[PDB]
Design a protein around this motif. Structure first.
Motif, mmCIF file in Angstrom:
data_model
loop_
_atom_site.group_PDB
_atom_site.id
_atom_site.type_symbol
_atom_site.label_atom_id
_atom_site.label_comp_id
_atom_site.label_asym_id
_atom_site.label_seq_id
_atom_site.Cartn_x
_atom_site.Cartn_y
_atom_site.Cartn_z
ATOM 1 N N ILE A 27 0.916 -1.246 0.132
ATOM 2 C CA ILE A 27 -0.119 -0.021 -0.053
ATOM 3 C C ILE A 27 0.791 1.178 -0.003
ATOM 4 C CG2 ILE A 27 -1.694 1.331 1.158
ATOM 5 C CD1 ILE A 27 -2.796 -1.139 0.234
ATOM 6 N N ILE A 28 0.625 2.148 -0.818
ATOM 7 C CA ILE A 28 1.287 3.413 -1.096
ATOM 8 C C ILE A 28 0.161 4.385 -1.163
ATOM 9 C CG2 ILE A 28 2.864 4.841 -2.197
ATOM 10 C CD1 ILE A 28 4.064 2.356 -3.304
ATOM 11 N N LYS A 29 -0.150 5.370 -0.094
ATOM 12 C CA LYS A 29 -0.731 6.562 -0.243
ATOM 13 C C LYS A 29 0.036 7.796 -0.311
ATOM 14 C CE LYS A 29 -4.686 9.132 1.870
ATOM 15 N NZ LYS A 29 -5.592 8.938 0.761
ATOM 16 N N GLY A 30 -0.241 8.520 -1.294
ATOM 17 C CA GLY A 30 0.524 9.825 -1.746
ATOM 18 C C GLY A 30 -0.415 10.885 -2.281
ATOM 19 N N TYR A 31 0.678 11.926 -2.544
ATOM 20 C CA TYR A 31 -0.092 13.237 -2.902
ATOM 21 C C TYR A 31 0.958 13.826 -4.150
ATOM 22 C CZ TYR A 31 -0.908 18.133 -2.815
ATOM 23 O OH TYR A 31 -1.467 19.610 -3.254
ATOM 24 N N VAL A 32 0.368 14.123 -5.263
ATOM 25 C CA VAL A 32 0.942 14.772 -6.342
ATOM 26 C C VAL A 32 0.994 16.222 -6.000
ATOM 27 C CG1 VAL A 32 1.121 15.171 -8.599
ATOM 28 C CG2 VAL A 32 0.155 13.048 -7.881
ATOM 29 N N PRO A 33 2.219 16.983 -5.935
ATOM 30 C CA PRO A 33 2.071 18.668 -5.952
ATOM 31 C C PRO A 33 1.734 19.002 -6.983
ATOM 32 C CG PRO A 33 4.541 17.572 -6.140
ATOM 33 C CD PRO A 33 3.548 16.503 -5.915
ATOM 34 N N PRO A 34 1.014 20.372 -6.756
ATOM 35 C CA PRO A 34 0.522 21.026 -7.709
ATOM 36 C C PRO A 34 1.661 21.357 -8.981
ATOM 37 C CG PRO A 34 0.515 22.377 -6.083
ATOM 38 C CD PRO A 34 0.788 21.095 -5.562
ATOM 39 N N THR A 35 2.528 21.908 -8.501
ATOM 40 C CA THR A 35 4.089 22.101 -9.515
ATOM 41 C C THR A 35 4.671 20.688 -9.969
ATOM 42 O OG1 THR A 35 5.275 22.608 -7.513
ATOM 43 C CG2 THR A 35 4.086 24.391 -8.491
ATOM 44 N N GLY A 36 4.129 19.990 -9.578
ATOM 45 C CA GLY A 36 4.924 18.641 -9.841
ATOM 46 C C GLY A 36 5.171 18.392 -11.369
#
Ligand SMILES: OC[C@H]1O[C@@H](O[C@H]2[C@H](O)[C@@H](O)[C@H](O)O[C@@H]2CO)[C@H](O)[C@@H](O)[C@H]1O
Length: 130
Positions: free
Chosen positions: A22-31
């Motif tokens: 399991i991997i929960k993550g977040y994509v930065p808006p400037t990614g």
């Protein structure tokens, strides 16, 4: 095997069939891009590379500094900038099976005949559970 909370990026986690990661993550808006690598030693059995620039999810394998053929086909892209994602990777006998937010994303047939998990790039991790 409890989950690791708020693991730093770049992430380096030490790792079998029928087991799900399991991997929960977040994509930065400037990614621009990030990568999830299942490695042996610097070889990569499965390289998962979402690129926000052109909205692709590139899969490949790295042997002796050489990349194999790219797999890119998807029915959906959960990695839009500024969005959170819930990723699961099941290790099967003949392939990886990867789901995003409960919906199948892709299968990846084993090319390499994997004890390390590497995550680097433009991504924030909420938790990783093996
Ligand atoms: O295949 C994964 C691998 O791709 C590299 O970039 C490729 C690119 O995807 C392709 O369109 C082009 O023809 O060749 C490039 C190689 O220079 C990435 O550099 C690498 O990080 C991997 O993601």
């Amino acid at each position: 095997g409890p989950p690791t909370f708020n693991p730093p990026v770049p992430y380096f986690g030490r790792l079998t069939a029928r087991r799900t990661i399991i991997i929960k993550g977040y994509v930065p808006p400037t990614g621009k891009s990030f990568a999830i690598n299942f490695k042996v030693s610097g070889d990569i059995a499965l390289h998962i590379n979402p690129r926000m620039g052109n909205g692709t999810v590139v899969r490949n394998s790295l042997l002796n500094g050489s990349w194999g053929s790219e797999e890119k086909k998807i029915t959906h892209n959960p990695f839009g900038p500024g969005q959170f994602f819930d990723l699961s990777i099941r290790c099967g006998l003949d392939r990886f099976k990867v789901y995003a937010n409960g919906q199948h994303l892709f299968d990846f047939a084993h090319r390499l005949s994997v004890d390390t998990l590497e995550i680097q790039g433009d991504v924030t991790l909420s938790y990783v559970q093996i």
